[PDB]
Amino acid sequence: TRKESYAIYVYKVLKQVHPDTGISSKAMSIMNSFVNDVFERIAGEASRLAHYNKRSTITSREIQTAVRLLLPGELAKHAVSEGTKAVTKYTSA
Amino acid sequence: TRKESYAIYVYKVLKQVHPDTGISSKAMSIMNSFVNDVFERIAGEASRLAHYNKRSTITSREIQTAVRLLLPGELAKHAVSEGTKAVTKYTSA
Amino acid sequence: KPNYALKFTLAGHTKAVSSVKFSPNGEWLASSSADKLIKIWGAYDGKFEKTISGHKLGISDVAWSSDSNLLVSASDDKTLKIWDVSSGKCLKTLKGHSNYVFCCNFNPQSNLIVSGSFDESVRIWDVKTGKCLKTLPAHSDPVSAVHFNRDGSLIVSSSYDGLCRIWDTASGQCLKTLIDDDNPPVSFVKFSPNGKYILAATLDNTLKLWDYSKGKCLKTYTGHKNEKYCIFANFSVTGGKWIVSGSEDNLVYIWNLQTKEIVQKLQGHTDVVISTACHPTENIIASAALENDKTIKLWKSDC
Amino acid sequence: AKAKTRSSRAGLQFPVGRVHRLLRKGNYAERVGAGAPVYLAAVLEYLTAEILELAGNAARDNKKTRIIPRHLQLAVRNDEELNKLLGRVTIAQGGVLPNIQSVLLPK
Amino acid sequence: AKAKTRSSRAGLQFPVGRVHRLLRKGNYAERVGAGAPVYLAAVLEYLTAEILELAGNAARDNKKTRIIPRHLQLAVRNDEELNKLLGRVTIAQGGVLPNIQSVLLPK
Amino acid sequence: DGTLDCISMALTCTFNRWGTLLAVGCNDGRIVIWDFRGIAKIISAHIHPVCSLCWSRDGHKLVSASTDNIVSQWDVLSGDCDQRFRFPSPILKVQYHPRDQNKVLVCPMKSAPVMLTLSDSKHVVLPVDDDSDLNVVASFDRRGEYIYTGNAKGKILVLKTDSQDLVASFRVTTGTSNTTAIKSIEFARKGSCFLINTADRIIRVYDGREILTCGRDGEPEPMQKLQDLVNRTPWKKCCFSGDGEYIVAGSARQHALYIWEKSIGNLVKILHGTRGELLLDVAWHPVPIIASISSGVVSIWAQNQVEN
Amino acid sequence: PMPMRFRHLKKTSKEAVGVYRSPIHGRGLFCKRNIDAGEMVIEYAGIVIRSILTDKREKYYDSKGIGCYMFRIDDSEVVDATMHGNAARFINHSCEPNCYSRVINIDGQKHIVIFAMRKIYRGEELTYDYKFPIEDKLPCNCGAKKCRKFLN
Amino acid sequence: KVLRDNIQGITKPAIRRLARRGGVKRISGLIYEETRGVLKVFLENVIRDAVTYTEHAKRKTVTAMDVVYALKRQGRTLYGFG
Amino acid sequence: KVLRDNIQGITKPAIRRLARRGGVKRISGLIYEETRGVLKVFLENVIRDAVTYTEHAKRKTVTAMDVVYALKRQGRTLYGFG
Amino acid sequence: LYRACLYERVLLALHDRAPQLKISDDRLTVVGEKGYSMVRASHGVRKGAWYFEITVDEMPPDTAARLGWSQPLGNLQAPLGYDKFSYSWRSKKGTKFHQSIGKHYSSGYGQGDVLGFYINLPEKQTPHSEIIFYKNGVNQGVAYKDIFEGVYFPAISLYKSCTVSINFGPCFKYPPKDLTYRPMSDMGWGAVVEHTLADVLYHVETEVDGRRSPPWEP
Amino acid sequence: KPHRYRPGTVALREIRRYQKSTELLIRKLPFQRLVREIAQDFKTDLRFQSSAVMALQEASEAYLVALFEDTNLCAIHAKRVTIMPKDIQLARRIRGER
Amino acid sequence: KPHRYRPGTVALREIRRYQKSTELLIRKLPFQRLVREIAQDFKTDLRFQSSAVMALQEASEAYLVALFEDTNLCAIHAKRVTIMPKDIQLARRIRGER
DNA sequence: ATCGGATGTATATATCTGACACGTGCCTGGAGACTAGGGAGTAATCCCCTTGGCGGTTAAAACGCGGGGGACAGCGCGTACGTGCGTTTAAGCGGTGCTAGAGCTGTCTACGACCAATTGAGCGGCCTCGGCACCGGGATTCTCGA
DNA sequence: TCGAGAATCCCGGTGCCGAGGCCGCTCAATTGGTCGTAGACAGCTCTAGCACCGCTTAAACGCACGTACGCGCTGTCCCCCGCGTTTTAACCGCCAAGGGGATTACTCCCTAGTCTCCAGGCACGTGTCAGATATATACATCCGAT
Numbered sequence A, B: 001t002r003k004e005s006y007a008i009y010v011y012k013v014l015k016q017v018h019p020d021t022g023i024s025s026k027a028m029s030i031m032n033s034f035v036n037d038v039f040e041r042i043a044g045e046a047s048r049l050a051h052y053n054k055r056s057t058i059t060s061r062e063i064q065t066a067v068r069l070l071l072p073g074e075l076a077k078h079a080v081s082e083g084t085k086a087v088t089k090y091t092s093a
Numbered sequence C: 001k002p003n004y005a006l007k008f009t010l011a012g013h014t015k016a017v018s019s020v021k022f023s024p025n026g027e028w029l030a031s032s033s034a035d036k037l038i039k040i041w042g043a044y045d046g047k048f049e050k051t052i053s054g055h056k057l058g059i060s061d062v063a064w065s066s067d068s069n070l071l072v073s074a075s076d077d078k079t080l081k082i083w084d085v086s087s088g089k090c091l092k093t094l095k096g097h098s099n100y101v102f103c104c105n106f107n108p109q110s111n112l113i114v115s116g117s118f119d120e121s122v123r124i125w126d127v128k129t130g131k132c133l134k135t136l137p138a139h140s141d142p143v144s145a146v147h148f149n150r151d152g153s154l155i156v157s158s159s160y161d162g163l164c165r166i167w168d169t170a171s172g173q174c175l176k177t178l179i180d181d182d183n184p185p186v187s188f189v190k191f192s193p194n195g196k197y198i199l200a201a202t203l204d205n206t207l208k209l210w211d212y213s214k215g216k217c218l219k220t221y222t223g224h225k226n227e228k229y230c231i232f233a234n235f236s237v238t239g240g241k242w243i244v245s246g247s248e249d250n251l252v253y254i255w256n257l258q259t260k261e262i263v264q265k266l267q268g269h270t271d272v273v274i275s276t277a278c279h280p281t282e283n284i285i286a287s288a289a290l291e292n293d294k295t296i297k298l299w300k301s302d303c
Numbered sequence D, E: 001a002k003a004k005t006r007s008s009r010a011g012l013q014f015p016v017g018r019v020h021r022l023l024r025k026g027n028y029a030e031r032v033g034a035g036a037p038v039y040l041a042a043v044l045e046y047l048t049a050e051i052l053e054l055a056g057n058a059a060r061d062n063k064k065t066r067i068i069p070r071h072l073q074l075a076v077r078n079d080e081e082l083n084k085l086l087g088r089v090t091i092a093q094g095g096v097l098p099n100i101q102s103v104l105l106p107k
Numbered sequence F: 001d002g003t004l005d006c007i008s009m010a011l012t013c014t015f016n017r018w019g020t021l022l023a024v025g026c027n028d029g030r031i032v033i034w035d036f037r038g039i040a041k042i043i044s045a046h047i048h049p050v051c052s053l054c055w056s057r058d059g060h061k062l063v064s065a066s067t068d069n070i071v072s073q074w075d076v077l078s079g080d081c082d083q084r085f086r087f088p089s090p091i092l093k094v095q096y097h098p099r100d101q102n103k104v105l106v107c108p109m110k111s112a113p114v115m116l117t118l119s120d121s122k123h124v125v126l127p128v129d130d131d132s133d134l135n136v137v138a139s140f141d142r143r144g145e146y147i148y149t150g151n152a153k154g155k156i157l158v159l160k161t162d163s164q165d166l167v168a169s170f171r172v173t174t175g176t177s178n179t180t181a182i183k184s185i186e187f188a189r190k191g192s193c194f195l196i197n198t199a200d201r202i203i204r205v206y207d208g209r210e211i212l213t214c215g216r217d218g219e220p221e222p223m224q225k226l227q228d229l230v231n232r233t234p235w236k237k238c239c240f241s242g243d244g245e246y247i248v249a250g251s252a253r254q255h256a257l258y259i260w261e262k263s264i265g266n267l268v269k270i271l272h273g274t275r276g277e278l279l280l281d282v283a284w285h286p287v288p289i290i291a292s293i294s295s296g297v298v299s300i301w302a303q304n305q306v307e308n
Numbered sequence G: 001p002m003p004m005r006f007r008h009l010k011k012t013s014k015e016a017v018g019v020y021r022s023p024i025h026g027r028g029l030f031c032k033r034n035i036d037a038g039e040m041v042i043e044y045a046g047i048v049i050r051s052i053l054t055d056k057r058e059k060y061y062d063s064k065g066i067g068c069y070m071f072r073i074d075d076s077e078v079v080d081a082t083m084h085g086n087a088a089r090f091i092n093h094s095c096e097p098n099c100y101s102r103v104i105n106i107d108g109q110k111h112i113v114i115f116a117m118r119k120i121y122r123g124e125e126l127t128y129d130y131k132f133p134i135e136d137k138l139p140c141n142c143g144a145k146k147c148r149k150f151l152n
Numbered sequence H, I: 001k002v003l004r005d006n007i008q009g010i011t012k013p014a015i016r017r018l019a020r021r022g023g024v025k026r027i028s029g030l031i032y033e034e035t036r037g038v039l040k041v042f043l044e045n046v047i048r049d050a051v052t053y054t055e056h057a058k059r060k061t062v063t064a065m066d067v068v069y070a071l072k073r074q075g076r077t078l079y080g081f082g
Numbered sequence J: 001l002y003r004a005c006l007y008e009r010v011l012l013a014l015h016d017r018a019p020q021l022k023i024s025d026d027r028l029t030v031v032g033e034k035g036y037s038m039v040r041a042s043h044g045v046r047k048g049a050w051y052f053e054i055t056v057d058e059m060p061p062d063t064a065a066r067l068g069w070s071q072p073l074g075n076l077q078a079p080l081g082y083d084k085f086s087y088s089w090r091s092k093k094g095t096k097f098h099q100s101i102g103k104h105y106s107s108g109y110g111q112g113d114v115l116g117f118y119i120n121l122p123e124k125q126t127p128h129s130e131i132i133f134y135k136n137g138v139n140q141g142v143a144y145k146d147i148f149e150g151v152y153f154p155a156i157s158l159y160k161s162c163t164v165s166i167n168f169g170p171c172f173k174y175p176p177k178d179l180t181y182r183p184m185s186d187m188g189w190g191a192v193v194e195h196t197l198a199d200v201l202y203h204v205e206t207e208v209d210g211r212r213s214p215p216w217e218p
Numbered sequence K, L: 001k002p003h004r005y006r007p008g009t010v011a012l013r014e015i016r017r018y019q020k021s022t023e024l025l026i027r028k029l030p031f032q033r034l035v036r037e038i039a040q041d042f043k044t045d046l047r048f049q050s051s052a053v054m055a056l057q058e059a060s061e062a063y064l065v066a067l068f069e070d071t072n073l074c075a076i077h078a079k080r081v082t083i084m085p086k087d088i089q090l091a092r093r094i095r096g097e098r
Numbered sequence M: 001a002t003c004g005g006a007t008g009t010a011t012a013t014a015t016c017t018g019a020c021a022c023g024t025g026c027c028t029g030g031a032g033a034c035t036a037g038g039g040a041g042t043a044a045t046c047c048c049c050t051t052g053g054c055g056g057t058t059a060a061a062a063c064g065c066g067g068g069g070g071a072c073a074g075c076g077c078g079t080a081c082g083t084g085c086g087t088t089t090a091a092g093c094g095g096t097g098c099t100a101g102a103g104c105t106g107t108c109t110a111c112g113a114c115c116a117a118t119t120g121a122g123c124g125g126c127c128t129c130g131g132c133a134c135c136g137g138g139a140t141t142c143t144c145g146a
Numbered sequence N: 001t002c003g004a005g006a007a008t009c010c011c012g013g014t015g016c017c018g019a020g021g022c023c024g025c026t027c028a029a030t031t032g033g034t035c036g037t038a039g040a041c042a043g044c045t046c047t048a049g050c051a052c053c054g055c056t057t058a059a060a061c062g063c064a065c066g067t068a069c070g071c072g073c074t075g076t077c078c079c080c081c082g083c084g085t086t087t088t089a090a091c092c093g094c095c096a097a098g099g100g101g102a103t104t105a106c107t108c109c110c111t112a113g114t115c116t117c118c119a120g121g122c123a124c125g126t127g128t129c130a131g132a133t134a135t136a137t138a139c140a141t142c143c144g145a146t
Helices: A009-017 A024-054 A060-070 A071-089 B007-017 B025-052 B060-070 B074-091 D016-024 D035-061 D071-080 D080-085 E007-010 E016-024 E035-063 E071-078 E080-086 F210-216 G002-016 G052-065 H012-021 H031-057 H064-075 I012-021 I031-057 I064-073 J184-206 K007-018 K030-041 K050-077 K083-096 L011-020 L028-042 L050-077 L083-096
Strands: C006-012 C015-022 C028-032 C037-043 C046-051 C057-062 C070-075 C082-083 C091-096 C101-106 C113-115 C120-126 C132-136 C143-148 C154-159 C164-168 C174-178 C186-191 C197-202 C206-211 C215-222 C234-235 C242-246 C252-256 C261-266 C274-279 C284-289 C295-300 F012-015 F022-026 F030-035 F038-044 F051-057 F063-065 F070-075 F081-086 F091-097 F100-108 F113-116 F123-125 F135-142 F145-150 F156-162 F164-172 F183-187 F193-198 F204-207 F223-225 F237-240 F246-253 F256-261 F268-272 F278-286 F288-292 F297-301 G016-023 G029-032 G040-043 G046-050 G070-072 G077-085 G100-107 G108-117 J021-024 J030-033 J035-038 J048-058 J066-070 J086-091 J094-098 J101-103 J114-123 J130-135 J138-144 J153-158 J161-168
Touching: A009 A024, A009 E035, A024 A060, A024 E016, A024 E071, A024 H031, A024 H064, A060 A071, A060 C037, A060 E035, A060 H031, A071 E007, A071 E035, B007 D035, B025 B060, B025 C252, B025 D016, B025 D035, B025 D071, B025 F237, B060 B074, B060 C252, B074 D035, B074 D080, C006 C284, C015 C284, C028 F081, C028 L028, C037 C057, C037 F210, C057 D016, C070 C101, C082 C113, C091 I064, C101 C242, C113 F210, C120 C154, C143 K030, C154 C186, C154 F038, C197 C234, C206 C242, C206 E016, C234 C274, C242 C284, C242 E080, C261 F135, C261 J101, C284 J094, C284 K083, D035 D071, D035 D080, D071 F113, E007 E016, E007 E035, E035 E080, E071 G029, F012 F051, F012 F278, F012 F288, F012 J130, F022 F051, F030 F051, F038 F164, F051 F091, F063 F091, F063 F100, F100 F135, F135 F183, F145 F183, F145 F210, F156 F210, F164 F210, F183 F237, F193 F237, F204 F210, F204 F246, F223 G052, F237 F278, F246 F268, F246 F278, F288 K083, G002 G029, G002 G040, G002 G100, G002 G108, G002 L050, G052 G077, G108 J161, H012 K007, H012 K050, H031 H064, H031 J161, H031 K030, H031 K050, H031 K083, H064 K050, I012 L050, I031 I064, I031 L028, I031 L050, I064 J048, I064 L050, J030 J153, J066 J114, K050 K083, K050 L050, K050 L083, K083 L050, K083 L083, L028 L050, L050 L083
Parallel strands: C015 C057, C015 C274, C057 C101, C101 C143, C143 C186
Antiparallel strands: C006 C295, C015 C028, C028 C037, C037 C046, C057 C070, C070 C082, C082 C091, C101 C113, C113 C120, C120 C132, C143 C154, C154 C164, C164 C174, C186 C197, C197 C206, C206 C215, C234 C242, C242 C252, C252 C261, C274 C284, C284 C295, F012 F022, F022 F030, F030 F038, F051 F063, F063 F070, F070 F081, F091 F100, F100 F113, F113 F123, F135 F145, F145 F156, F156 F164, F183 F193, F193 F204, F204 F223, F237 F246, F246 F256, F256 F268, F278 F288, F288 F297, G016 G029, G040 G108, G046 G077, G070 G077, G100 G108, J021 J030, J030 J161, J035 J153, J048 J114, J048 J161, J066 J086, J066 J153, J086 J094, J094 J101, J114 J130, J130 J138
């Protein structure tokens, strides 16, 4: 059964931050579960706020607002800046 | 702007249980908010379960299961009965 | 239909007779009265056997032992008294009823006594020690008649409050309460010989046979007169199946058991025929009347 | 063209059509079970009945025709099942149910 | 027409295609914005960077290359904002971060 | 549901043949014969408490067992020690023979049950299957025609009361493959259904005819299986109803009384005693009254009809 | 469930309530075990009949001098307990009732059950509102301070 | 119009009133300001999150439904405001 | 195969091990069984709710994702199991 | 559209029966199972004098039908006389029942009675309106002289398992020889044609501008 | 001679009447000013609904009486009738508020 | 002469090594039997994943050490080093578990 | 432990009213009827995880066993806190007045929706090998009696 | 308090399988049209908020003061920690059966989507009593003398 995960991108960004490091597959699964958790969190919050806004379209403004609702302080600030830079890069082409 | 509610329905069931007893608008809107909250509870839970079943359709069995998940013991039991009654009364249409 | 004819007339009680009972062997007839005296008589010739005294007040009931050896006497002195019928000795005097004791009966094994009193409580008594083993607030009115079932497992009780209550013997449990849509003062009650039915007299000129397993009246018997006094009723079985009773009209009524129809009317008593007794073996009926008669009459039929 | 609402078809009060439109606009599933709105609304009817009933109990316990939110708080705090249902829930004008601890009483 | 991943044009590591797939399959909206998966995936990558960095810090502090869940739990209970985000979350093989109370000490 | 203050140190009780009297043992070693609502007799039985008491069929004799391994027969009218015997391996139980009061079976602690007579001070040692049980309960059937002996190893022997010959046999199971200590064997005063209390806390109801037709070393199934599926509570003492269609068990763990039926086996009801009382003894009125002995105190549980 | 509650009520009715001499009047229903509010106190059990047959029965009892024990189930049915009933025929009335009559539907048949208006304690005499229409006069001795002095 | 120091605008009598409502007999002084802090901290979240809603609402006034959805997201939902 | 009394299968050494992990020095006996009860009560919910999921899952075996969604619904979510 | 009636003759309208009311078109008899219920005919009188019958085919002792007239507003679950808009007879002894009140101003009823029912309403009692009851044509007498306004229709109430049937005039047994009274069928097709014209006039009103009717009197 | 009730007694009756009452126990305007002061920290010149701020104050006071309640309970477990700040802190700790 | 460390000291080191260790502290099979016993209460003969039951036991023990932790804290506020059941009860009370 | 006095609180009363039950005309969501697709349901197949058992081990649990350590009870004091009464103070009513900003309608348009054609990023599966886990042994450091 | 001893840290060496890397092998991602439409935006209201200001007053702050719980200390009991021993069953490894889980392929019942019509719901007026409020009163309860 074709099961999808992210541990490959985990290894990728690890090498991006720590090239000389290994991981326990256990820890990879833990991190992936964490990925899923934050994803469902942000998605549910975005859908809920759009419902409050009666919006049927979830866009990057919703993304940023919901992250700010979820992440604290500089975590949220850095995340907002990063998402902004990335969507700018993608929209540049 | 038309704003829907259930004050009509809550008043109906009030009379059906207590034709004598009155109602305050504050507690009325309290009832309305509450039923909205619990309906969203059951909706999210059933959708989550069906997504686990990966079933794009949401049926009554899901509702029974998820309310059983939701209600503390005997309530659910009582609950499901009338629910069954309902669909029976509606399937017998 | 019976043809009971007067054979022997018995008398001697200085006061109103309250009960006459045939000995289970049919050898004697015990007659109690308010004169504090009991009289044993010959059951076939009307021969006065003896008088047994010792009770301090009037006697409201007397009952034989199954072996025809003992007699319990319930008197208005609030006491019972167990006597040896052969010696006339007061073997026991039962104290504990707080008021006038009106009825008394032995268990089918003759080793136990049931007693009803004016205290509206039924007392259950030992024989060999004469000790009260149980006491029950049975009725809301003075008890009229108490009796055992065929084996001694059930005790039926009647009282002036109109209630007929069946109680458990081993536990005193009030098993059943028979009601007839009114409150007719029940002056007499007893089990059927088969223990299946119950005969109860109410003070409205009415006798009622009830089924125990059904708890409902099966048959009714009228035509007599009984509204104030404790008039006894007996099952005539030595010949045809009849119901014999006294009546306030100086008559001795005999109904058919099944058809409930009067099968004989024995006349000759001048006062209310207060007590009745049916012979256990022969077609003999002792009918004792009240003080305006003071006589007991033996009747013998051929069927 | 005889008309009959699904609520009457269920002989109930809560609007099956309205709640169906609501869940549709709620973006939970692509298709829906047609009897699911009936069922859920019946459940709502039931639970609402119980809570309002306890509310009215407190109300006429206080000779109060029109129910006050304090009645609601007392009701939701008395029943174990409903309290468990709404433990982390707060109620406007709720207040606190009567509760004095043992040692609080002077001896 | 060569096909490059949209995350490349976003210059990111997590598959935004899989993201948007889960999004559409998640029953959140009738139609997802274009850059919304991009933004949220960027947030995800950033926070993963933060947590993995903290984990590597802990592991190297413990002179460990392979990072066991204990390191991650310790870092979790070491970051106050992350803890606040995850204090309601339980951690397998987490144990408890060393916390010693004052009156617990001997004398 | 009604207790008695007039007796103390209640340890063991026994109904007479007709459920009119109750002989209860006391810690002082006295017999208190109480009538169903005062004490009828007091007998100085032993200095040692009495742990086993049985009425005679005529009711004029009572067999009593002290903790001093002293068994004694007493006339209920007089209270005299008609006979007295002593053994090793202190006696666990005595039991008059239901159809011959001269005979009485005795279950000792460590030795095999022995059947004695009162006329002649003889004794017949009943056989033991495994020769190493050291704990075998035994009982007459309803008529005293057979002897049912159950060991600590779940083995069940049915002997004939006269010849002690093995007329039936089978070992009860814990389900899988294991044995269980036979706590007690009880019979019905009416009919042929009997019950077994075992260490598995599961009461097993059988019909003795089915064991007789099952023969030696067979697989007889129970008429019923009865337990507290909720609490898994042991049973200190159990007994049938007088008719034999109701069965009661005494949860000494929580001092409660469970009441099931016979045919269906569904739980009739539950009676709760003082949570602080330790349940010791249980008996049913032979002809709906139930006597309980707990912490030396007796309680009565009746059942009335719709009237009164 | 109303069926389960009704089974429980019919099981406990014989030992929950009694009938004794009443200071209200004659004999009446007293509480023998503390009864909670709203719980089933007692069914007024009896002969379930149609309404059209009431009068023919009533006049019948009027010809027999036997008092009518009838309670209106609804516009179509009546529980007549004159000849066949239960202990509920001995529930006095009070202007301040701790009880109240309600009709329930069990398996299609209607049962008139007196429930407890409040938490009733042992020894209390059971009384409800008969709601008898105003006639032209039965004096009441319920003892309540709000007593209408008359059921009607 | 720059505001400040309304935290101490919370009167100690108000605090002790709330405490008595909570069923408290004896209280120390050290609590109140501490209390206040918590209060602040508590509301510290919601308003922000609330205006966050208003953030996405693109509006200048703040509404109740904001704090409704906040307390909801804060798992402290409230009734009686739509 | 009817199971029972595995609650006491929880060893007091295990309980005190968990307590030491929680940083506890002195413990009383009365706790353990009490502890056990709580334990039971705690799991009392989840498994049921879990199999409730499995209920709707129409399956005979019970999976981790069941308890995942339970603890989620129980507000005690866990990571590392999909 | 049209009000076409599923009937070969003017019969007991199925549209106005209770769900607990059974019919047998072999004799168009009506029967029930629990308590009382009410059924009515297809037609309804508004003026004039007319007449019908009820034939009883089964009357056990626990079976008591009631037969009479009832205006609309008559709850078809009630026993035909429980309200003030219905006037009937109880088929145990001839007893006039109205407002649930029984009156013995009547004759005696028989188990096999073929009962004739005459009733005259004029073109606050309706002036000169009355009701007369016959047993097999023999005058059982006047039942109700006081008759309230509003259209009436013949109705039958069932007790537990009652078997009775309504019947028109051309197959009668003891008919009155009056030239003015009309059988059930005649008033039936009269009302049917009247409602046909009602449909005509309503579709005229909504469809074409204008309306016009002759010199009012008829 | 002047009378003074014993300590707590008056406060006890205050507790009783406050569990009796249900309305707010905070003056409106000070609370509102505090809210707006907090608001300008995140963004200045923001308006509010009176309903909104009423909700804020009600929900706050609810959380606050809950905190006071369970801190009272903890102090019971602390065997004192006086409250200690550590009780509140550790209560939040158990409330996951740390 | 035999040596015995002072009380707690050994338990103190146990605490230290347990905060050092991370694995489970409950025997697998007893926990599993308990789980299946609980399961048959709601429905009998239900199967499980070893991963599932491992998750059950891990999450349980986590909740349990959290309870032990904050009850330790409360007992600090109780000024005792011995634990009292009331501490656990009231902790659950603050944990909303009552 | 009681009684007397103070005080605070539950009650009846009167009226005021403004929420509030009630009824309307008008609107549109709900019902009713019809069409399609395709999610769901069923069934046969495979797999394969689980549940079951069996034997050997010991680390672990049970149990016992002092015994110092603290839970706890009590006991002195004192400081901090209720209280009732002073004082002054903003809180609330209320009513005024402006408009900034919600809040509504009407476009029109960019923007995914969606489908279709294309495929390489990614995933199951297969080696592989090296940090890592275990072990044994030596050296270090805490701790409890001087 | 300086050693003895004990639990621990660390070091080297052994052997392993999971971490990882690479390989077939897609389907899901991309690309590109194409279309109806969500909302972006403009442009109006109006109203609710926002502030103003005055008037009344219940409320708040502080004082003094009793006082009584918090706290600190002592001695006791018991009891749980630590260690020793004995018993056991968790574990672990292996085997085996099947029964359920997952899969795929059909098949079609039901729901989405459309269009029509109207009737229940909703905004909006409208009398009107449940209860808010105030007052005097009768009852309950604390606090101190006896």
